[PDB]
Every structure is written in structure tokens, then in C-alpha cells.
DNA sequence: ATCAGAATCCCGGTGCCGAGGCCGCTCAATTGGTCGTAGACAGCTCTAGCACCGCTTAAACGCACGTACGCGCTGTCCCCCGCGTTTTAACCGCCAAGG
DNA sequence: CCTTGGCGGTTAAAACGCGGGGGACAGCGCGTACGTGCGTTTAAGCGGTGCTAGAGCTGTCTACGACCAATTGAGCGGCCTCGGCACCGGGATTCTGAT
């Protein structure tokens, strides 16, 4: 449990650098965790809800693609 | 073995992140995070490896675009370092809370 | 000839779009000329992508088109990228960009 | 079953445009996912247009108007110029 | 000379049900006649997406139930789905 | 109207026909129109439940376009629904910044 | 024409938005900010006019344009 | 008597948020729309409802964009805005790349 | 605190042209017969998911050297806002076409 | 019959200077923490390997809502009376500036 804080700080630092940032502050990681919590919440609710409407308890790859397309995040290379 | 001033290998490291295409985030930690997050919704669920990979890749792309937004806000603010309030301003403009 | 696609000099199948429109419930009545037109529309749509994909192929001196090549190709141009503003390529990556403030003082 | 796509249609189009350059089937699925969203958007726009005119079917003029609506001026002009010959040749054969 | 659908008295009736004494000016009716039908269009589009994604050509009452939960927050959608299910059950049990 | 026997003010037939007129699917169950009409009636009920209160707060009974818009933005769920859509003569809720205000 | 918008109009608009002082080079952009923001919208509308098959633009073409551009308006038949 | 520049400005800020009265006259808006639309096609008849709807939408958009600009300036801890403020405001939304 | 300066706000008083209840028609909502079909339950396969378990390394945490960009002074210079005088044309009320 | 053009005219929507003054913003004084290299640890990274639980697909049903044909009365389209809320002068006051 408590894997929201379990996200490694250097991983968020690498993502921020890949966002083209030269100096990385120590409070960036926690803000990233807080934002990513809700960002994952929205997409997980969408995809699992698509799965639930089809009377399924196991989410496949296609429902993720459908939910992302509805939200405006169509993903290539994984089908869709 | 000599040490360089700030900004030498960092930008190179940035290039190492931008040139490369494989998932920089290690798989199993984010996998277990997804497990815990989804387990809070309904217990005793099974999630496909293909789906969790798509979710992780989408999360990586969303994060890198979000730090692009944070960089743009910081540059507009005449700073180099990024701060949480940059993201606070950016998200409210985008409209996602 | 015999096939509708090859008769009119269009490679993409009109039948696929016609079947989609019919058994997609988008409208009770589905035209035949409109799928013919949209077949050529899709043909030119894919032709443009393959047109800049060839030029992006020799950027890294590579032949197999990979998601990195697609991100290097599609994103640089304007019209498709703006029409695909909410489109991300899986395992593609971002264009190598260095901002103005990226130099230490 | 029979899962219809443009797997060899895209190959033939590429051979017409750039036969000396290869691709990978992952890019083929990428193009499939691209054209799926594009077709869904086109179908939605044409359905809305036909509803505005209270139309039960979609004709070539509506498709041309939707192409102007979605594609930019240069791209819409190219698509219309390439597609008028399509219906012209389809009428004869 | 077409008698098009509108919410001239539907709004007034539901207003009386929620408030015995409250008026509404027609300039606000201009807002309502568009906004209510646009939320209707949002829900209908979500239902169409649900039906098309799960390969369904026949739409049942279960599509909207979770389409609302997707389109609305959980707190707002919970009351909506409860009231809708209650109304459906009462309609079925009645004449 | 069968909405009278359904315990619903919004007629079922208009919802059913609008679904049929919109061509959203080939077939639709009987529950979908009644359930959709109930959902719309509940949603507008909360629209008018706050709109009436807003009118009554201003020593008023008639509702102006300004009266409805505030009730839209007063909530956070209702604001979430109408997040990126503006209503004519609706405007924005007042908001005063302390940093702009003089010392 | 392009500069038909007057400076005090933009000044009062900035007061409405909550701006006390405006820098010198912002004004020239501000007028332009509307233009393209209108342009794209009417860039749909005229095309909708082509779909409208009418020389007169009804108030529902602008509803289409605002629905597609993301700035749909209620209250006025939208 | 003479007040500081900003007291009347903040009075204007408070009052303009409770008034929906259109600032700029409708004739300049008509001039803009007609002149720009002359490029696409002539014989364009703009009915009163369309003009009013577009005017209100444009004013609401400009007020919201000024609000985002002021928010970014507050993020920059400044009162007077700069061109990069509005540039960032239109940049974060994704309309500008 | 100790003066003034304008400008809103309620009280008293004034309008007003459509808001709301009501005439009417009228056609869409609603309901008795008929069908058929994809929704629906159940079962065979099965296959990737779950989970365990064995063998391996750049990533994660911290320890430690350095300087410089962010934060706060330190001017510094300043250019649109309130105030003052000046220009003008916009659109309710009118006319006409007109399409 | 709604949509387009065109005069009345005269006060508000601008339309351009004057003083100016807190604020936008380019230089100085100063810190700690992030760049960077490395000690130390490891838990994940990669990959066999069995149990399996409903998804994919198919066997076997099938309920009632879409098509037809008929009845009405809800409600929309419009019309009359007067009124809920917009709007102008007099006191209460309510903000703030300069000292």
C-alpha cells in the first residue's frame, strides 16, 4: 500500500527533464503525485465503467482505447 | 574522474530521455501502483498486461506533456526551475482538476 | 472490369465504408456515391502520411517505419497535427526540442 | 472471422507513392487506429449535416462540404480535386 | 406553420412541482430550451457510444444508467440514477 | 401522455421520438426513453430548485437570464457540467482579487 | 478596419477582466486576438453556409460553428 | 478629488463583473465580421440573432482570457500584464503551439 | 485619526410591453394487434492473468564538493490612469426596398 | 414577413494631452540545494511454470419493443390584462484620498 508516494522521486525528475526543464525542485514530485492521482482516477473510472456496462469484471485493452478516445487521448499501436 | 558545473550532463541526460523511446519508468512499481489504485474500486480483480502497459504509456505521455506545460509557465515567469504553482496555474487553464 | 474499386482507379475499398455506414445505424438510408468519394478521401489521407513518412525515413537512414519515425514526421507538419491535436503515438516519443532558457548562466 | 482492414490496401497505396520505402505492421495498426477515429468524426459530422437539412442519406455534396469543414483549405482543395475524378471515373466504369 | 417541440409549459410544471411560487422570464426560457436539450444530446451521445462500443444494436435502460455516472460526478449521478430507476419501476408497475 | 402514469412530467413520447429522430441506434428499449426522461426531469428539477431560491433571495419571483447562470456556477458539479460552455447574458460570478485591491 | 477597435474599449475590457495597467505592445495583439478567434469560427460558418444552401445566414449556422469550435452559446437559440 | 490610479481601476474591476452590458458597440463588431468574411464569400446576410450571439461569445471569451492573463500575472507576482502573459494564456489551452 | 470628494443604494414614484393564464386546433403522443431478432442464458475452450519462484543490474537513497539562480534589497525610470479638454456618430424611431 | 439598406440628432462612447507615482524591472547582497560524482543496497528486470475464471465463441431460447392502424387532448401557437421588475429623483452612506 501507499504506492502513491511509492513513485520514485528520480522517475518524476526524469519525466520533468524529458519535459525540457533544467532545474528540478523538490516539491515538484509531490505535486506530480497529487495531479497524477486524479488523472489516473478519471481514466480508470472511464475504462472500468465501460467494462462494467458490458457485464464484465475484467478490463481488456479495447475499453481503455475507447475511454481514451472519448476523453481525447486516442492511443496508437495498441489497437483501436 | 572530474566533476562538471551544473547544466553539462543534465542537458545531455535530457537528450538521453528525448532521443530514447522505451519506457523510462520501471514497470513493476507502476504496475503495483495500478494494482493498488484499482483494488480500491472493486476487490479481487484481474487486469490485463496489455491494458496496464497502455495505461503506463499514456501516463508517461501525459506527464511529459504536463511538464512541458510547467516549463512553458516557468519560462513565462522568468525562471528556470519549475514549481508546483506552475502546475496549479496550468491545470486550471486546461480545466482538469 | 469486375471490382468497383479497381474500375474507378481507387485502391481503397468502397464496400468497407458502405458496409460501415449501413450497419453502423448512422442513418437509415446510406448512399453509394458518398462511400465512393470517401474511399478516395481516405486514399489521399493515407497517401499524405506515407508521403512524409518516406522523407522521415531517411532522417535516421532507416527503412522500417517505427513510432519514432511517425512522431518525427506527423508532428512537424501543421495541418494534420492541428487536426490531430489530441493524438499521441504509442512508444513514439517527443521531438528533440531545447528551449531558449536551457543554457546555464 | 473476417476482420476487414486496409492491411494490403495501405501497402498498395504506399507502393503507388513510395514503393522503395518499407513499413512495419505496428505502423499498419497505428494507421488503422488513426483512420478509425477519422471515420468516426467524419460520420458524426455528416450525420449532423444531414440532420440539419433533415436528410436521411448522405450524398457526395455533403461529403465535400464536410471535407471543407474538417480539412484545411489546402487539404480540402486537394481532397476535392482528387475525389471529383473518382466519381467521374466511377460513373463510366 | 410547424408546431415544433419546446419547453414552454414543461418548465413551468416542473417549476411548480419544485417551487409553488416562482416565476421565470422568457429570456431565461431561451436559456433553458437550449440547455436542457443539449444535456439531452450529451446523454444520447454517451448512450450511443456505449451501445456502439459494446457491439449492441438494441439499447436497453441499463445504458443510460451508467452513461449518467460517466457524464456526471458520482454524487450528482447517484440521485439521478436512483430517481430514474424508481420512475421506471413505478411506470412498469402502474397501468 | 404515458408520463402521467409514469410519475413524470416530461412526456415519454417526445424523448422516444427524439431518440428515433436522431437515429442513435436501430432499436431502443422501452426503459431507455422513460429512464432518460426521468433523468432529464430530475436534472432540471435541481436546475429550478436553485433557480427559484436565487430568484427569491433577490426579493424577486421572475427569473432573468442572469438568475439562472449564477446557479449554474454556484455549484461545483453543475459548474463541472457547464465548464467550457458559455450562456448568453450569463457572464461570470463576481470575484475580487486582494492583490489588485489597494493596501 | 483591423485597427477599428478603439484603445479605451480594450482598456475597459482589461478592467473587466481585472487588469489595472497594460503594457505598450499588448494592445496590437489584443485586437488581433479577437480577429482569428472570430476568423476560425466564421471559417466554419461560411462553410456551413455552403452546407446551408442559402445566401442568408440563419442563427443556427453560428450554433454549428460554436458547437464545433467549443464555445457553444445558450439563451439565443443555441 | 484626484484618486490613485487603481482605486477607480479596482472599482471598475468590481463593477464590470456584475454588469453584462456590451462594452464595444455593435457596429465595429459588424465591421470586423463583414470585412473578414468578405474574404471567404460575398452575399453573406448576418441576421440580428447571430450577430448578438457572436458578440456576447466574443466578449465572454475576452473576459475569460483577461482573467487567465491576470491569473498568470499573479503567478508572476505582477500587476501590469506583459505580452508573454496572453501568449501563455492562449498557449496552455492548446489553441497555440 | 481628521478633513473632504464623488458615486452608489434604498425610498418614493414611474412604466411597460410582454409573462402567464387562457382560446383553439391538430397532429404527435398513446394504445390495441403483429414478428422477428439480436438480446440472453448456458456451456466448451482456453489463454492470457494471477501468482509463485529462480537468477540477475542500472536505478534508488544517501554522502559529499561546489556556486549560482532564486529571493530579497536597490535603486530607476517610467508610461498608461484619473483628470482635463475635445470629436464624433448610433441607433430608437422613421422611411424605403427586397428577396 | 423577416431581413436589408437609409435620415433625426445629441449626449455618451470614445479620443487625445498633463501630472504623476506606485509598480515593472534591470542591477547588487546572500543562501542551500541541485548538478555531479560516487558509496551502498536492492528490489525490480527477465524469464520458467502451474492454476484458473470468467472472455471469446458457439448451442439453444425467446420477450417485448419496432412496424401497422386508430383515438384523443397536451401542448404548442397565439392573444388579452395588468404587473414584477427595470428605471429616475431624495436621503443614507460608502467607499477612498491627502494630511
Swiss-Prot record, chain B:
Sites bearing N6-crotonyllysine, chain numbering: 19
Any one Gene Ontology BP term: telomere organization
Subcellular location: Nucleus; Chromosome
Mutagenesis / variant outcome for changing residue 40 to N: In BRYLIB1; uncertain significance
Modified residues (Phosphothreonine): 43, 70
Residues bearing the modification N6-(2-hydroxyisobutyryl)lysine: 19, 27, 42, 85
Keyword terms of this UniProt record: Acetylation, ADP-ribosylation, Chromosome, Citrullination, Disease variant, DNA-binding, Hydroxylation, Intellectual disability, Lipoprotein, Methylation, Nucleosome core, Nucleus, Phosphoprotein, Ubl conjugation
In-chain residues carrying the UniProt-annotated modification N6-lactoyllysine: 19, 42
Reported effect, residue 88 to R: In BRYLIB1 and BRYLIB2
GO molecular function, one term: nucleosomal DNA binding
UniProt modified residues of type N6-(beta-hydroxybutyryl)lysine: 19, 42, 85
Modified residues annotated as N6-glutaryllysine in this record: 19, 42, 78, 85
UniProt PTM comment: Acetylation is generally linked to gene activation. Acetylation at Lys-85 (H3K122ac) by EP300/p300 plays a central role in chromatin structure: localizes at the surface of the histone octamer and stimulates transcription, possibly by promoting nucleosome instability.
Sites bearing N6-methyllysine, chain numbering: 19, 27, 42, 85
Modified positions (N6,N6,N6-trimethyllysine) in chain numbering: 19, 42
Modified residues (N6-succinyllysine): 19, 42, 85
Self-association state and partner proteins as the record states: The nucleosome is a histone octamer containing two molecules each of H2A, H2B, H3 and H4 assembled in one H3-H4 heterotetramer and two H2A-H2B heterodimers. The octamer wraps approximately 147 bp of DNA. Interacts with HIRA, a chaperone required for its incorporation into nucleosomes. Interacts with ZMYND11; when trimethylated at 'Lys-36' (H3.3K36me3). Found in a co-chaperone complex with DNJC9, MCM2 and histone H3.3-H4 dimers. Within the complex, interacts with DNJC9 (via C-terminus); the interaction is direct. Interacts with ASF1A, MCM2, NASP and SPT2.
UniProtKB/Swiss-Prot annotation, chain D:
Residues annotated with Phosphothreonine modification: 84
N6-crotonyllysine carried by residues: 3
Cross-link Glycyl lysine isopeptide (Lys-Gly) (interchain with G-Cter in ubiquitin) residue location(s): 3, 89
Compartment(s) of residence: Nucleus; Chromosome
N6-lactoyllysine found at: 12, 54, 77, 85, 89
Self-association state and partner proteins as the record states: The nucleosome is a histone octamer containing two molecules each of H2A, H2B, H3 and H4 assembled in one H3-H4 heterotetramer and two H2A-H2B heterodimers. The octamer wraps approximately 147 bp of DNA. Heterodimer H2BC11 and H2AZ1 interacts with VPS72 (via N-terminal domain).
Name of this protein: Histone H2B type 1-J
Protein species of origin: Homo sapiens
Gene: H2BC11
Curated annotation (Swiss-Prot), chain F:
Record note on modification: It is involved in the initiation of both imprinted and random X inactivation. Ubiquitinated H2A is enriched in inactive X chromosome chromatin. Ubiquitination of H2A functions downstream of methylation of 'Lys-27' of histone H3 (H3K27me). H2AK119Ub by RNF2/RING2 can also be induced by ultraviolet and may be involved in DNA repair.
Modified residues (N6-(2-hydroxyisobutyryl)lysine): 21, 59-60, 80, 103
Residues with PTM N6-(beta-hydroxybutyryl)lysine: 21, 80, 103
Domain of life: Eukaryota
Intrachain S-S bonds: none
UniProt keyword Protease, yes or no: no
The keyword Acetylation appears for this protein: yes
Protein function: Core component of nucleosome. Nucleosomes wrap and compact DNA into chromatin, limiting DNA accessibility to the cellular machineries which require DNA as a template. Histones thereby play a central role in transcription regulation, DNA repair, DNA replication and chromosomal stability. DNA accessibility is regulated via a complex set of post-translational modifications of histones, also called histone code, and nucleosome remodeling.
Protein family membership: Belongs to the histone H2A family.
Subunit note: The nucleosome is a histone octamer containing two molecules each of H2A, H2B, H3 and H4 assembled in one H3-H4 heterotetramer and two H2A-H2B heterodimers. The octamer wraps approximately 147 bp of DNA.
Protein's recorded name: Histone H2A type 1-B/E
Native organism: Homo sapiens
Gene this protein is translated from: H2AC4
Location of this fragment in the whole protein: 17 to 119 of 130
UniProtKB/Swiss-Prot annotation, chain G:
Cross-link position per record: Glycyl lysine isopeptide (Lys-Gly) (interchain with G-Cter in ubiquitin): 67
GO MF, one example: protein heterodimerization activity
UniProt modified residues of type N6-lactoyllysine: 7, 53, 67
Effect the entry attributes to changing residue 8 to L: In TEBIVANED1
PTM per Swiss-Prot/TrEMBL: Acetylated as part of spermatogenesis progression prior to histone-to-protamine exchange.
Phenotypic consequence of residue 16 to H: Found in a patient with a neurodevelopmental disorder; uncertain significance; results in early developmental defects when expressed in zebrafish embryos
Covalent link (Glycyl lysine isopeptide (Lys-Gly) (interchain with G-Cter in SUMO2)) residue numbers: 7, 35, 55, 67
GO biological process: chromatin organization; negative regulation of megakaryocyte differentiation; nucleosome assembly; protein localization to CENP-A containing chromatin; telomere organization
A GO CC term attached to the entry: nucleosome
Keyword rRNA processing: no
Domain of life where this protein originates: Eukaryota
Transmembrane found in the keyword field: no
Primary localization: nucleus
Family: Belongs to the histone H4 family.
Identification of the protein by name: Histone H4
Organism listed in the record: Homo sapiens
Gene: H4C1
Part of the full-length chain shown: 26 to 103 of 103
Amino acid at each position: 500500500r501507499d504506492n502513491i508516494q511509492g513513485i520514485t522521486k528520480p522517475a518524476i525528475r526524469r519525466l520533468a527533464r524529458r519535459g525540457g526543464v533544467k532545474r528540478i525542485s523538490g516539491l515538484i514530485y509531490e505535486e506530480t503525485r497529487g495531479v497524477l492521482k486524479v488523472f489516473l482516477e478519471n481514466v480508470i473510472r472511464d475504462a472500468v465503467t465501460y467494462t462494467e456496462h458490458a457485464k464484465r469484471k475484467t478490463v481488456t485493452a479495447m475499453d481503455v482505447v475507447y475511454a481514451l478516445k472519448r476523453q481525447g487521448r486516442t492511443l496508437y499501436g495498441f489497437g483501436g | 574522474p572530474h566533476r562538471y558545473r551544473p547544466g553539462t550532463v543534465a542537458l545531455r541526460e535530457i537528450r538521453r530521455y528525448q532521443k530514447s523511446t522505451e519506457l523510462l519508468i520501471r514497470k513493476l512499481p507502476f504496475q503495483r501502483l495500478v494494482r493498488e489504485i484499482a483494488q480500491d474500486f472493486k476487490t479481487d480483480l484481474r487486469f490485463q498486461s496489455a491494458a496496464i502497459g497502455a495505461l503506463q504509456e499514456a501516463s508517461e505521455a501525459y506527464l511529459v506533456g504536463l511538464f512541458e506545460d510547467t516549463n512553458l509557465c516557468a519560462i513565462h515567469a522568468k525562471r528556470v526551475t519549475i514549481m508546483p504553482k506552475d502546475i496549479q496555474l496550468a491545470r486550471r487553464i486546461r480545466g482538469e482538476r | 472490369a469486375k471490382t468497383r474499386s479497381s474500375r474507378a482507379g481507387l485502391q481503397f475499398p468502397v464496400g468497407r465504408v458502405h458496409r460501415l455506414l449501413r450497419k453502423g445505424n448512422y442513418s437509415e438510408r446510406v448512399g453509394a456515391g458518398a462511400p465512393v468519394y470517401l474511399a478516395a478521401v481516405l486514399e489521399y489521407l493515407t497517401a499524405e502520411i506515407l508521403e512524409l513518412a518516406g522523407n522521415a525515413a531517411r532522417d535516421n537512414k532507416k527503412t522500417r517505419i517505427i513510432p519514432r519515425h511517425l512522431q518525427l514526421a506527423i508532428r512537424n507538419d501543421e495541418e494534420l497535427n492541428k487536426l490531430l491535436g489530441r493524438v499521441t503515438i504509442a512508444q513514439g516519443g517527443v521531438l528533440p526540442n531545447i528551449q531558449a532558457v536551457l543554457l546555464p548562466k | 472471422s473476417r476482420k476487414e482492414s486496409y492491411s494490403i490496401y495501405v501497402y498498395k497505396v504506399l507502393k503507388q507513392v513510395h514503393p522503395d520505402t518499407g513499413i512495419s505492421s505496428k505502423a499498419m495498426g497505428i494507421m488503422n487506429s488513426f483512420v478509425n477515429d477519422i471515420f468516426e468524426r467524419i460520420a458524426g459530422e455528416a450525420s449532423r449535416l444531414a440532420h440539419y437539412n433533415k436528410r436521411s442519406t448522405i450524398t457526395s455534396r455533403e461529403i465535400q462540404t464536410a471535407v471543407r469543414l474538417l480539412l484545411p483549405g489546402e487539404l480540402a482543395k486537394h481532397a476535392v480535386s482528387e475525389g471529383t475524378k473518382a466519381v467521374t471515373k466511377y460513373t463510366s466504369a
